[PDB]
Design a protein around this ligand. Structure first.
Ligand SMILES: Oc1c(Br)cc(Br)cc1Br
Ligand SMILES: Oc1c(Br)cc(Br)cc1Br
Lengths: 116, 116, 116, 116
């Protein structure tokens, strides 16, 4: 499990539960091919998106559906979503944790990258 | 006047200067059509991207080239760029200020939507 | 001129107005002596706290009353206030801008130290 | 273990290891009495600071020594430290996780509060 996503709600001070997350990988023809997807758990975490074998070198895009999250709570947010784009495993396989801290008009994203 | 971008450097504690910024508008076929662009000033600001007249309601993508910024500084970044996607709306305030706080492995983006 | 404070509201996406701010200077006996104070403007800014002449090198504490801000909005905050402690230094740039991005259960503070 | 602290380095994209953390509780005479302290682990986490019985209602101050952290890395940071002040357990016992995202000239602090 080399790719993990963690989302927190900065308004309620709690994990952001049931947030949809889509991952894409840039193709040779520079198109974004669907790679994996899922939803955050009660702890705001999304594990099991991919494997070490599948998670090859490449440029990935993790798109977090923050809009649906805020709308379900009765809030009209600014962003359509929070999307992280990055090159992965270009110096060998690494473990990535993409953390997103959400607010209606602001979000922060941090990457904690460790060598397995 | 209606759209401004401000970028700060959290490592050196100063405005992020000469950062490339491109704005796109989502087309009917869901592809991103180039709309406006430029580079941040000595104060880390980028104004005059569009006019009230040209900035119609729609989905806009603001792509900030954070990677080139850090690479020039000789610092190894994580993200390929910082992308801020949002829907421009007449119902809400007129002026949009997209502020991005940058760090090599983390970034935050906040919108300050005001009428005046 | 040498010290400015800017506060933003990440929930409503606007400047945080009428936020109480107090600045203290650490005394020889390590107690915090009141130095300057005021409230944020309609633009979420607070200028004219001190002069270059009065702002000598030393340890300063900037206490932002985030709790009263959220309570007035009828939103339950976590923090009692946001405290930014730092050492003013002549070796580095002259002007200090303390920016605080507020959310009920989270806040960020960045310093933009520039000479001009 | 109702009080946990987590610190991440936004420059390296890794946990902030060996960061000293001091906790204080406001006394009746409004002085800050030392409550507990420790250092972050290899995962950037600090557990075992207190217990449910000891962690009574009160106003607490968690002071994170970010200055020593950056100085050890050859960087002269802006903040003397990152200090969170908050009222705890005023609506019954809760579990608190204080997360701090660090950068030389900026830091964010988030509180994830759950009902045990
Ligand atoms: O566990 C984490 C929390 Br809580 C906050 C941030 Br930011 C990142 C991670 Br990983
Ligand atoms: O001027 C700004 C600062 Br400094 C920080 C953030 Br966040 C937004 C604005 Br506008």
């Amino acid at each position: 499990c080399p790719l993990m996503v963690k989302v927190l709600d900065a308004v309620r001070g709690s994990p952001a539960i049931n947030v949809a997350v889509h991952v894409f990988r840039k193709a040779a023809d520079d198109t974004w091919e669907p790679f994996a997807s899922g939803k955050t758990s009660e702890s705001g975490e999304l594990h099991g998106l991919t494997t070490e074998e599948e998670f090859v070198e490449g440029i990935y895009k993790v798109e977090i559906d923050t809009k649906s999250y805020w709308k379900a709570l009765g809030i009209s947010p600014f962003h359509e979503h929070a999307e992280v784009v990055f090159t992965a495993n270009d110096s060998g396989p690494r473990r990535y944790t993409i953390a997103a801290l959400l607010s209606p008009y602001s979000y922060s994203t941090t990457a904690v990258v460790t060598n397995p």
